[PDB]
């Protein structure tokens, strides 16, 4: 804290409490007894534990029929309107599209759709699977999952 | 009628003015006016001016016939105080409070 180490007043004779510095934490305008510092909150998770949780999550999605497997999922042109129509007739509004190969055409179509996400099998995280109401996996996307999950 | 009238930020202290206020509380305006006229206090002329204003407000903005008016309510409230530094002996300093007050007078014909 900006200031000086000079004692505000003498140790004895003054009728008020002993003080040592203007920057003491019990003083106005300067203090904070335990000041925070920039810290890393990331924690270690074992590889097997990460895989086990991912396997556990996928199984339960299948059990709650929240996971739908279909053939290749693609859009002819990079238009959000087309993607909205394709998801409308399927009665899906909050979906996570997982495809084996990432194509810019599908990536751009879903960019402006908040409730819709497009992802690759490699870039799969537990939070996304849990958060999204429905998960749609392509045939290719499914295959890569077992290979990486093993 | 209400026909209130107040004077805010009077320099006189609330305690000192409050002695004069108690004299005329509940009395008719005619008796209140000459009571203040012959009261030897600074607060007397402050309160009298407020009472004159209240009577004028009733006469102009409200019904006439100010003869039958009475001071139904009168109270003095402490106002903002000005802090001043007054040197004392041995280099010490002390705070002088210039106390103000709000004088409120309410007159009605009933």
């Amino acid at each position: 804290v900006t200031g000086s180490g000079k004692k505000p007043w003498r140790q004895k004779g003054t009728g008020r409490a002993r003080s040592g510095s203007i920057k003491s934490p019990i003083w106005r305008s300067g203090g904070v007894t335990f000041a925070a510092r920039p810290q890393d909150h990331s924690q270690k998770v074992n590889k097997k534990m990460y895989r086990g949780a991912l396997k556990s999550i996928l199984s339960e999605l299948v059990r709650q029929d929240r996971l739908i497997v279909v053939e290749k999922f693609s859009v002819e042109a990079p238009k959000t309107k087309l993607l909205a129509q394709k998801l409308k007739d399927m009665a899906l509004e909050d979906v996570l599209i997982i495809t084996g190969e990432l194509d810019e055409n599908l990536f751009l179509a879903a960019r402006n759709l908040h409730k819709v996400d497009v992802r690759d099998a490699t870039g799969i995280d537990p939070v996304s699977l849990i958060a999204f109401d429905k998960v749609v996996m392509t045939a290719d996307a499914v295959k890569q999952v077992e290979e990486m999950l093993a | 009628m209400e026909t209130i009238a107040k004077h805010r930020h009077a320099r006189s202290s609330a305690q000192k003015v409050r002695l004069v206020a108690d004299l005329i509380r509940g009395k008719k305006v005619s008796q209140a006016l000459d009571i203040l006229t012959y009261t030897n206090k600074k607060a007397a002329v402050l309160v009298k001016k407020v009472l004159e204003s209240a009577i004028a407000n009733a006469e102009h903005n409200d019904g006439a016939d100010i003869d039958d008016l009475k001071v139904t309510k009168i109270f003095v409230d402490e106002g903002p105080s000005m802090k001043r530094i007054m040197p004392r002996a041995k280099g010490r300093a002390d705070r002088i409070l210039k106390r103000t007050s709000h004088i409120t007078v309410v007159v009605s014909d009933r």
Binding site: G13, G15 | G91, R92, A93, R95
Partner: peptide, 17 residues
């Protein structure tokens, strides 16, 4: 509001030994 500056010795120099 503000601490004094002179801070004279208030105690009287008279020890009761």
């Amino acid at each position: 509001n503000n601490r004094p500056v002179y801070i004279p010795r208030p105690r009287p120099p008279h020890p009761r030994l």
